[PDB]
DNA sequence: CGCTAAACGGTT
DNA sequence: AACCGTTTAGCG
């Protein structure tokens, strides 16, 4: 049983990208604080940051 | 299709 | 526990 695909709001995407520009890796507390501010689950933030690092590494390589 | 969220098996 | 590298798949 797969989880439904989260559709992030524009506010959530803007805040996630502002976080990522500041810090490429978050502490457990910072990750939880971001999830709470955005009404997202801890896992959805953790997964967004992980996939964001994948995209970031792709862009670094060119 | 392209982007990207979630899942897999493996690593740190 | 979280991450990595990669895959799988949802959807505009």
Author numbering: 232 to 293
Wording from the paper:
Transcription factors (TFs) recognize specific bases within their DNA-binding motifs, with each base contributing nearly independently to total binding energy. Here we solved high-resolution (<1 Å) structures of MYF5 and BARHL2 bound to DNAs containing sets of dinucleotides that have different affinities to the proteins.
Thus, Thr278 orders water molecules in such a way that they contact both bases of the AC dinucleotide.
